[PDB]
RNA sequence: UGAGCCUGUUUGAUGUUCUAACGUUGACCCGUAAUCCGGGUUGCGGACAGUGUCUGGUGGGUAGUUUGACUGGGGCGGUCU
RNA sequence: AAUUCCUUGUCGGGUAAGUUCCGACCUGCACGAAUGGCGUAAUGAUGGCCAGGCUGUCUCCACCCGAGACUCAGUGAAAUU
RNA sequence: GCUCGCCGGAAGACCAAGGGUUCCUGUCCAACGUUAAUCGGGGCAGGGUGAGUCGACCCCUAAGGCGAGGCCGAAAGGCGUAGUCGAUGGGAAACAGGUUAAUAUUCCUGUACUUGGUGUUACUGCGAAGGGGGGACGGAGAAGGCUAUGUUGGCCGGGCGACGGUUGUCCCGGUUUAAGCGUGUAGGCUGGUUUUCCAGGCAAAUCCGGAAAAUCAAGGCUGAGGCGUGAUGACGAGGCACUACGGUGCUGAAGCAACAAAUGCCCUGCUUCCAGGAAAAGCCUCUAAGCAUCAGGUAACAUCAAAUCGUACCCCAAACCGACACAGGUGGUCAGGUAGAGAAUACCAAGGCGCUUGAGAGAACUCGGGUGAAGGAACUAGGCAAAAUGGUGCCGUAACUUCGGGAGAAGGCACGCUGAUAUGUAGGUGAGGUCCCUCGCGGAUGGAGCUGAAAUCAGUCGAAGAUACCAGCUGGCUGCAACUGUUUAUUAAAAACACAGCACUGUGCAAACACGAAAGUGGACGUAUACGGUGUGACGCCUGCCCGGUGCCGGAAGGUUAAUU
RNA sequence: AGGACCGAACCGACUAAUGUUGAAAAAUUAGCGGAUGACUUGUGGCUGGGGGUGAAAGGCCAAUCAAACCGGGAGAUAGCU
């Protein structure tokens, strides 16, 4: 749910948050924690690679479960928890022979719903199979690119893929973005689509909010002398030329794809 | 009025000591420089 | 299918198929007490991608430099045989 | 007008008297819509103007309390020429 | 030696870093000390630092470093696996009194505790480079129980006052005791035990995880404080004699209760919030290979061992960083009385200091201060500087607004001391006694004793009762930027930068992009509700016309053009 | 509850006077902003000069920055004093 904050402040007149009164009030499970420490952007030579990092919380990661390759045995959700690392809640499953494990949570998951995998599970939410085995025009998530890797696409909050045609050993995939992809028949998906679809609607409302979360500001490139960018300089304001990147290339509308090898996978591009 | 100077013994070991400078090989010039002209200290340490 | 040449001749181009060079930041086994490395088995691509020599285009991202004299001070104007 | 050269433009209010301030006119030397246009409660060791109280800022300065300056014994520099 | 003045959340006491003999004793006054010097952190000689429990060394790791083979590179070299280092973090054990010119949890007295080796007895399934538990973790808030600590009574010792009174409801001093051992309280968390079975924990399991039955409902863990013992001991005002003025030997009275109360302890607890809050070892358990007469394991006795290094002195400072015996800088701990909300301010306690040139005089002028007739900004670029308001409780308060604000708007009234309501009230704490019990650090009642605000009524003094220190000036109209924040260390703190919100464009994951002659690394252990670049800058109403020029995106029939042949 | 309010320790630097061969090669006195957060502080570690870091002032990189310090080419060149 969605809640707008009173102007007692104004740092909290703009603010509006999203709360789930479902999620676990707890310690997350500890035998699948793992250490996580912080880079500010640096590279093993110690440069600044990537701007606008640093600070923020700690954080510790949780070893969610990708592959879904444990077949026969139906599983049980326990609760839904809170994942700092993703926009995604994610569910903690417990199987049949005393194993439990992470997985994404999709759209109306709750606590005592079954879960199966492999080629002769049934075609509702939560359950996963090889593609070669789903009807055609069907919505999934977390889908595989190559067999036994992983998921790597839609894996974000309310994200899905469309299924739109099938031949020989190839299916044809609508994304997120607007493009058909071809992939192999033999890889797999999971039914449905990803929840928290509420997580674009909130509003962090003063800069404290974004430096919690690791970004620090903003230079433009026009605020400078001509030594730090090629937009700098002027008595007053002044531009006089297109616009560029830190390194002299043009944005705005130039494009940067250069990959021979893998384009004979793109059917059409996004639009 | 706060100023350069703040000693530290593991720093200044840790900078300009002997291993330090046996460490690599522009260090082991700066000893052969030294040697020739004759110091009686070689390095920092104490 | 274009030139030679009597349905045979070699090279030219275009399109489809194949595996054996080459790629794999897909799975399993060993060195091994090891998410580097190498060897093995099996899938997926495949003469494409990528690298060396030569060659046309773009290139203030970077570098080396030039931007004249007379003159009731210099500049603007005018002049230089 | 943080923009108007001619300019202290012209009319009104405030003062005994107002090149600054507030409201209008349009004759915009040379405003104008994301190198944004027009408004806007709260906030500002931010620019401009007007009032009450308060006073040595001032008409116009007088007295007093301490530290130097001045005399005595000890030590004892400097720029420049 | 007597008197005077200053600090006292420090100008007192103590750790770490840094320094290195500056520490105690005897001697000297040439140079050093901004003056003299018998004095000194100055010259010369000797003396002084005692550990199984304090630190370091030691065991374990974080960020990071190095790195056998290995992958790259004209050489020099770069990156990294297995490993090995690296604290600011985790891991055994001691208290009180006495003593020196200089050391004290180290030396002496009294009473304790922890970990290893060897031998004898009694019982006996042991064993890791492996499996599991534990160590093990955020921000704010609240009130319940305690202690360190202070005040007053009771008790003990002394006193009867330099000038009116002082045998009393009077004056001064003391009334201290630890670690260890035993008891499980205020309070927090959690159902116990037996049986059968199983696609899990890289192989096994009596261990952890899952499933199904019978049975009893009260077991298990943590835990400040108090009470007993340690203690017929030690300490304690005063007394008994010689003084080298530094002590020795003996002796030694009282040593209880009530109230008030921490920022310290129970508390790593409890309640809530999102921005979701380290790793390894020491420790407890399960088994494999292997051993079974043995070896190893558990407990009680006896005995041996705990090595090496530091330990003096300075720390808002004359001994550290500033060339100085320099008005500057420097992490952590301790926290008495009266008034006060207070760690602010004023006066004091414990303790420590008067700052290393003096004596006179009482001109102009400079520096720091107090008072001022009548006027009250007339000064000046400008109310720059100075003058002024200032506390608590109760009345009362406008335009405008994003409905929270404006607001402490503005403007008012009361405020000392004594007596009564009540020989000390409303409230807090709480003994003796009477009952009960599953018997103890138990429950109900009962109110002795102690402590104690605010209000009303009547009197009284001064010019003045928030009397000292301390402690907001108020209002009206306009430009700019929405707001809290940041910036030219050393002439510019702003209308300049950032910000939450908006739009354009690139990127299908071996992603675009950046550091690298390369291997590689960040983006990210992320996946289009995600990531990079560019411009605008809360919020409300909006954002018109032009594709000729320069850029970017798409097209394919024509014309022009490189190497090669 | 709050990038909420008043105000000490703590972090800063808006105004005036003194000082300018200073007690001080950036300080003293009286006033002034923040003060539960985009806060402040101790110990270690990383980024190297046409390079680093930069809420962006040509700011900082050991009292030195429109290209640090040290040693070399080196007795660089100087139609100038």
Excluded at chain 1, 89 to 106: C, F, H, M, S, T
Excluded at chain 1, 131 to 155: D, F, W, Y
Aim: one cysteine or more; hydrophobic letters at 30%.
């Amino acid at each position: 749910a969605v809640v707008k904050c009173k102007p007692t402040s104004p740092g909290r007149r703009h603010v509006v948050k999203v709360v789930n009164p479902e999620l676990h009030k707890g310690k997350p499970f500890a035998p699948l924690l793992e250490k996580n420490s912080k880079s500010g952007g640096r590279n093993n030579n110690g440069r600044i690679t990537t701007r606008h990092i640093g600070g923020g919380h700690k954080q510790a990661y949780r070893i969610v479960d990708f592959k879904r390759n444990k077949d026969g045995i139906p599983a049980v959700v326990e609760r839904l928890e809170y994942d700092p690392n993703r926009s995604a809640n994610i569910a903690l499953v417990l199987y049949k022979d005393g194993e439990r494990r992470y997985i994404l949570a999709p759209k109306g998951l709750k606590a005592g719903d079954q879960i199966q995998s492999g080629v002769d599970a049934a075609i509702k939410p939560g359950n996963t199979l090889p593609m070669r085995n789903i009807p055609v025009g069907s919505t999934v998530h977390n889908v595989e690119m190559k067999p036994g890797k992983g998921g790597q696409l839609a894996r974000s909050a309310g994200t899905y893929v469309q299924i739109v045609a099938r031949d020989g050993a190839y299916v044809t995939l609508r994304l997120r973005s607007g493009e058909m992809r071809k992939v192999e028949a033999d890889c797999r998906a999971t039914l449905g689509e990803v929840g928290n679809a509420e997580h674009m609607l909130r509003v962090l409302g003063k800069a404290g909010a974004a430096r919690w979360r690791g970004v620090r500001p903003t230079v433009r490139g026009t605020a400078m002398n001509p030594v730090d960018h090629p937009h700098g300089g002027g008595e007053g304001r002044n531009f006089g030329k297109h616009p560029v990147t830190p390194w002299g290339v043009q944005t705005k509308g130039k494009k940067t794809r250069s990959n021979k090898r893998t384009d004979k996978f793109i059917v059409r591009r996004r639009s | 009025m706060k100023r350069t100077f703040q000693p530290s013994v593991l720093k200044r070991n840790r900078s300009h000591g002997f291993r330090a400078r046996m460490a690599t090989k522009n260090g082991r010039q700066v000893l052969a420089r030294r040697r020739a002209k004759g110091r009686a200290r070689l390095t920092v340490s104490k």
